[PDB]
């Protein structure tokens, strides 16, 4: 959907 | 020869590369002083063609 | 209305064939300088100059009038194309 939200989630994994 | 039919079909990466006269490797259009096209950019005469007739 | 348009429509099986006949004949007349006309000197369409009556420059007016006389022959596959071209160039040079 929203790419920056997706990237921020993937970053919040580590 | 006279045109009779018109066909439309998917294009293979090989077909596409066969259309191509060169790869556009830089996101450059024209030079800020000379106003001429940049090498390997979107307007390069090396790929697309001469800007002036027979020159 | 174009003079005698009803008879012209009588001559063909489809009005568009009339149009094709007339246009090809107008092209013949223009290409050969009207030297190939089937029109007698008195049947020549005339236009009123400031000096006096001169010939009509309009090849379509001509071609229609020619068609009304019966002296023209129209139809499909009456002669090979290049043969008609060369024979007209022979009888009427450009």
């Amino acid at each position: 959907s929203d790419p920056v939200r997706q990237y921020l989630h993937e970053i919040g994994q580590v | 020869k006279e045109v009779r039919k018109v066909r439309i079909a998917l294009a293979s990466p090989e077909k596409i590369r066969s259309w191509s006269y060169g790869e556009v490797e830089k996101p450059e259009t024209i030079n800020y002083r000379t106003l001429k096209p940049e090498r390997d950019g979107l307007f390069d005469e090396r790929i697309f063609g001469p800007i002036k007739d027979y020159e | 209305a174009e003079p005698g348009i009803d008879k012209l429509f009588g001559m063909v099986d489809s009005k568009y064939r009339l149009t094709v006949v007339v246009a090809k004949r107008a092209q013949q007349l223009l290409r050969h300088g009207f030297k190939n006309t089937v029109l007698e000197p008195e049947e020549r369409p005339k236009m009123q100059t400031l000096e006096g009556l001169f010939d009509d420059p309009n090849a379509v007016t001509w071609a229609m009038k020619e068609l009304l006389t019966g002296r023209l022959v129209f139809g499909e596959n009456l002669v090979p194309e290049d043969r008609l071209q060369k024979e007209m160039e022979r009888l009427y040079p450009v």
Partner: protein, 1112 residues
């Protein structure tokens, strides 16, 4: 000439200032006359108080702003293509919370455009108007659910872009749902976040049968406000981590944050009046002592449940009611864009507060004004409501300023505009004119403020009524909104009055828009005037009550298209509004106080007032308007003339002695004429041109630039290659055409030379050069020439140069030259004329005088209108205008016939008899009896039943004259028209649509870049579009070659079109067409889409339409 006015209605109040909707709105938004500390929290002051303080130095706060004086006057602004604006400064203080250090400074935020006296603007040298916008007012509404009868939807609506719309519905499963940003969730959750408990909601909402049961969910009451808040934050934000402070922030910004959510002041008022509550702020809830506190939601749900159950005193809402639609005027729209630019400035302020030295920061180091500047610049240059001002005539501008649009930013997108928005709602009465709207796509979406109407501080439109108590009509006039008006019984303005008492036992009145017959005891108010129902333009139509509305629309609209004429006249029949329109449009110049006129000049009037002070009024003379019509003023006083306050000094454009002069009074015959007025065409007499009727001045502006190039400079010069003295005759030493010269199409206005480029001489050029032994010059002729179909007399030249005082141009341009060309336009064949009753047509024939129908005394008629235009148009007002015009033509007088209270048939007949005496007894004393032709026409008229048999010829001619008809002789035969003909004076205007501007032709010309098809438009020497439907026409005729020609040889087959032009100039037949270039463009664009498009032959083997040039 004497002016007789009709009508018995005495109007208590004059029309309000007609541009006040603009001027007062903008004054309120700016408050520039108010000392800062006394300013209210409205306007740009409100924008400042919304943005500031800015926090997280640590704090930046706002003290006050101020507006300076404009850098340049309005005339100079029009000259130099500037904006008429004032510098804006704001006093800000930076405060470090820890250091306590306080640094305060007056920072410069850029310029704000200023409104002129008449309510317009000057943006980049062009006058513009900010059009008011109509929209749904903020508030709480209740509508019937269209899906489920008996169920209703509650809607909470804030101001545009001040928060989301919220819906409350009662689901088929019984639970009450809230929808926000297209997200349905149970309302009980948010109710719990508000801090409500099941006990409070059960005692509040329990009285409604079975409804509160859908509100009871135990899993919701089992969690404290914190957990329910996190629950809602997860329901509204999938994927975002549910941190407590983040949920508080989001929900606060959604409902309680006044910097983000804002009902109007009107939104708050309407919510309060509807739900029976009182609001502390303008949000739906508050953040108080760490917890959310409810304002709006619970009353809304109470009202919704009550409307569903059917409990009395609860009703659905009509969203088209003018009590639920409001107007956003210029001040509000500009303040909104100011607020947006300020928000950007504050985001940049915080971004700067995080970076940079924390110790050393000023207000100036923190604030970048550029985004605010940008917001103002875009609102005034490119907004939809910011329109190129229509100043064709003064009424054009006044009407433009009183417009109301339903489109625009936050407005209805078209095709979302059905019948309801476009309807005239009963509440339009007295507020929005029911006739003045565009025909076509915009119908109903652009409307006009009624003449007496006013927009209040909440943005609702109010109309005046007279207080009536016990059959007595006071002079107290109360301005009501539609909501207030629906409370009363309002009698019609024409109700018979003896003194101030009602004289009819049956009175026509309105109750909630419904017409009702009522006793004087029941009358609560009364209309002020019929004028109050119509716009300013409709109010200019005499005998409006006799014109069907669909043509009154056209006459109304077309008055704004009338061209100012050099001999313009006021109408011989007027409505009485003709002078207020001149006064309020600031057309004419007036006397400021009593005094004596000292000097009178073509250019200036000097007046000495009662103070002894000497005031000098300069006159605008031959100025060009937005539409190219001459705007100028002429002195109407004389030296030594004594003048009182408010007396006419100079007449503006289209003004005769202070009266609105949109056209000319012409002598008209209503009869067919040899087909030359077939289907609304018009016939006119050459006599109209001889005496300069319908002649207008028009000024055109031409502009050219000389810039620095990479091949050398352009220059304005008189030295132009290959041009004779014949070509350069009217050019002065510098190369600009001389003032006063006559310029024709092809003539040079400004000589300019440009250095040639990419120059490779082709061998023909080299050989021709050697043959004629002439060097090819370095430069070439790029001069500005008169375009085809234009020309006139040069009346002005402006020249701006780089390196000259006060002059700085866009980078690279050395100089700019503007030439002004005036032309005098006589009426001609194809020009559009029209009257105030929607009768419009184009002049199709101009007859010499001796062919015009003429009266027996030798007077010929001015124009001949076809009677076939009248029946189905049903605009009989023009006929009454014509009869009264005949009467006034012979009595030498003019009239004022107010709409719905004006000249009736019997009084027109009296005037016509008085006129007949002048028209006939003069003859009978001059020694002439009745004429043979008149006798024959009288016989014909007797057969028509138009006169009574047995009366004398004079009695019968008078019977005809009383019907408006007269004997008329055909000027070609001298024989009479077999009938008596309607003849009289009619007011007729020349509209802006003149065949001079519209006639265009093209053989060949410029082609478009990508498509290689001709350009469009008269200015680009363009070609006509042969669209899909013209193609269908040609296909239907079966004209294959005509169509193929349209598609190839005439548009974008390059080889074809070149070969065709060469063939025709050689006298050869045209060559066969080939592939149109835009088909090749299509093929290459499909290849760009990774689709291979192959032209094949009958053996299915490819064919190359690119002739190998695209294959390796």
């Amino acid at each position: 000439m004497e002016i007789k006015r009709f009508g018995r209605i005495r109007e208590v109040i004059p029309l309000p200032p007609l541009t006040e909707i603009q001027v007062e709105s903008y004054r309120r938004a700016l408050q520039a006359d108010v000392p800062p500390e006394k300013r209210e929290n409205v306007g740009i002051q409100a924008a400042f108080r919304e943005t500031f303080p800015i926090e997280e130095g640590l704090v930046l706060d706002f003290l006050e702003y101020r507006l300076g004086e404009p850098p340049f006057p309005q005339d100079e602004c029009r000259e130099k293509d500037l904006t008429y604006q004032a510098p804006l400064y704001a006093r800000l203080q930076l405060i470090h919370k820890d250091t306590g250090l306080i640094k305060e400074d007056e920072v410069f935020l850029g310029h704000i455009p200023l409104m002129t006296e008449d309510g317009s603007f000057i943006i980049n040298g062009a006058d513009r108007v900010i059009v008011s916008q109509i929209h749904r007012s903020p508030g709480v509404y209740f509508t019937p659910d269209p899906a489920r009868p008996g169920r209703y939807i509650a809607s909470i609506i804030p101001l545009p872009k001040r928060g989301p719309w919220i819906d409350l519905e009662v689901e088929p499963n019984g639970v009450v749902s809230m929808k926000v940003n297209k997200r349905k969730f149970p309302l009980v959750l948010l109710l719990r976040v508000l801090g409500y408990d099941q006990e409070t909601l059960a005692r509040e909402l329990g009285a409604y049968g079975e409804l509160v049961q859908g509100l009871m969910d135990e899993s919701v009451f089992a969690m404290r406000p914190e957990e329910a808040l996190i629950r809602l934050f997860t329901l509204l934000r999938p994927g975002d981590p549910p941190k407590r402070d983040k949920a508080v922030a989001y929900v606060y910004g959604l409902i309680a944050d006044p910097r983000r959510y804002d009902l109007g002041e009107a939104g708050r008022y309407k919510a309060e009046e509807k739900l029976g509550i009182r609001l502390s702020g303008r949000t739906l809830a508050r953040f108080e002592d760490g917890e959310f506190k409810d304002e709006v939601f619970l009353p809304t749900l109470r009202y919704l449940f009550a409307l569903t159950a059917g409990v009395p005193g609860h009703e659905v809402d009509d969203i088209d009611h003018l009590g639920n639609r409001r107007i956003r005027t210029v001040g509000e729209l500009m303040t909104d864009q100011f607020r947006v630019g300020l928000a950007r400035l504050a985001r940049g302020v915080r971004e700067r507060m995080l970076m940079g030295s924390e110790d050393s920061l000023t207000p100036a180091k923190l604030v970048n004004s550029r985004p605010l500047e940008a917001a103002i610049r875009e609102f005034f240059s490119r907004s939809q409501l910011s329109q190129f001002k229509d100043e064709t005539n003064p009424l054009s501008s006044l009407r433009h300023k009183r417009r109301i649009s339903a489109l625009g930013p936050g407005g209805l997108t078209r095709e979302r505009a059905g019948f309801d928005v476009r309807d005239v709602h009963r509440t339009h009465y007295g507020r929005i004119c029911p006739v003045e709207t565009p025909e076509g796509a915009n119908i109903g979406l652009i409307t006009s403020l009624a003449a007496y109407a006013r927009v209040d501080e909440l943005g609702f439109i109010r109309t005046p009524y007279r207080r009536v108590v016990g059959g007595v009509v006071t002079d107290e006039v109360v301005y009501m909104t539609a909501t207030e008006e629906d409370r009363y019984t309002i009698a019609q303005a024409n109700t018979p009055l003896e003194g101030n008492r009602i004289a009819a036992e049956r009175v026509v009145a309105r109750r909630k828009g419904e017409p009702v017959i009522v006793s004087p005891e029941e009358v609560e108010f009364m209309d002020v005037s019929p004028k109050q129902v119509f716009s300013v333009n409709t109010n200019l139509i005499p005998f409006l009550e006799h014109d069907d509305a669909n043509r009154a629309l056209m006459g109304s609209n077309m008055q704004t298209q009338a061209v100012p004429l050099i001999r313009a006249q006021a109408p011989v029949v007027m409505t009485g509004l003709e002078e207020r329109v001149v006064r309020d449009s600031l057309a004419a110049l007036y006397a400021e106080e009593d005094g004596e006129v000292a000097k009178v000049d073509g250019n200036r009037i000097v007046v000495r007032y009662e103070d002894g002070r000497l005031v000098e009024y300069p006159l605008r003379r031959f100025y060009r308007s937005n539409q190219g019509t001459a705007l100028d003023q002429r002195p109407r006083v004389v030296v030594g003339q004594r003048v009182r306050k408010g007396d006419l000094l100079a007449d503006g454009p289209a003004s005769e002695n202070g009266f609105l002069a949109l056209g000319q009074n012409v002598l008209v015959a209503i009869m067919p004429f040899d087909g030359y007025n077939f289907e609304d065409a018009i016939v006119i007499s050459e006599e109209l041109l001889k005496r300069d009727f319908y002649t207008s001045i028009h000024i055109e502006r031409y502009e050219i630039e000389a810039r620095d190039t990479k091949l050398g400079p352009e220059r304005i010069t008189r030295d132009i290659p290959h041009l004779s003295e014949a070509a350069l005759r009217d050019l002065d030493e510098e190369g600009v055409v001389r003032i006063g010269a006559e310029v024709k199409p092809g003539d040079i206005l400004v000589g300019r030379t440009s250095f040639k480029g990419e120059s490779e001489p082709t061998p023909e050029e080299r050989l021709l050069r050697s043959i004629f032994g002439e060097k090819a010059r370095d430069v070439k002729d790029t001069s500005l020439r008169v375009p085809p179909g234009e020309g006139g007399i040069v009346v002005r030249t402006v020249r701006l140069r780089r390196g000259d005082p006060g002059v700085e141009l866009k980078p690279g341009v050395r100089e700019v030259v503007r030439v002004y060309v005036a032309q005098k336009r006589k009426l001609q064949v194809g020009d559009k004329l029209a009257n105030r009753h929607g009768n419009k047509g184009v002049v199709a024939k101009i007859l010499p005088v001796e062919d015009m129908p003429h009266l027996p005394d030798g007077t010929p008629v001015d124009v001949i209108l076809n009677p076939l235009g009248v029946p189905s148009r049903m605009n009989l007002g023009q006929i009454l205008e014509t009869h009264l015009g005949l009467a006034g033509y012979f009595l030498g007088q003019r009239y004022i016939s107010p709409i719905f209270d004006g000249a009736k048939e019997p009084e027109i007949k009296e005037l016509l008899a008085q006129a007949f005496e002048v028209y006939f007894g003069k003859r009978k004393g001059e020694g002439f009896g009745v004429d043979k032709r008149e006798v024959e026409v009288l016989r014909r008229a007797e057969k028509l039943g138009l006169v009574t048999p047995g009366k004398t010829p004079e009695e019968q001619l008078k019977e005809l004259f009383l019907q408006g008809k007269v004997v008329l002789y055909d000027g070609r035969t001298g024989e009479p028209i077999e009938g008596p003909i309607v003849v009289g004076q009619m007011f007729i205007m020349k509209l802006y649509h003149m065949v001079e501007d519209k006639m265009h032709a093209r053989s060949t010309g410029p082609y478009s870049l990508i498509t290689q098809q001709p350009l469009g438009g008269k200015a680009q020497f363009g070609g006509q579009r042969f669209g899909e439907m013209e193609v269908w026409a040609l296909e239907a005729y079966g004209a294959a070659h005509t169509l193929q020609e349209m598609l190839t040889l005439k548009s974008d087959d390059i080889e074809g079109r070149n070969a065709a032009y060469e063939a025709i100039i050689k006298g050869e037949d045209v060559p066969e067409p080939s592939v149109p270039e835009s088909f090749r463009v299509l093929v290459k664009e499909l290849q760009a889409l990774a689709l291979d498009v192959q032209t094949l032959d009958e053996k299915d083997n490819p064919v190359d339409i690119f002739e190998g040039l695209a294959s390796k």
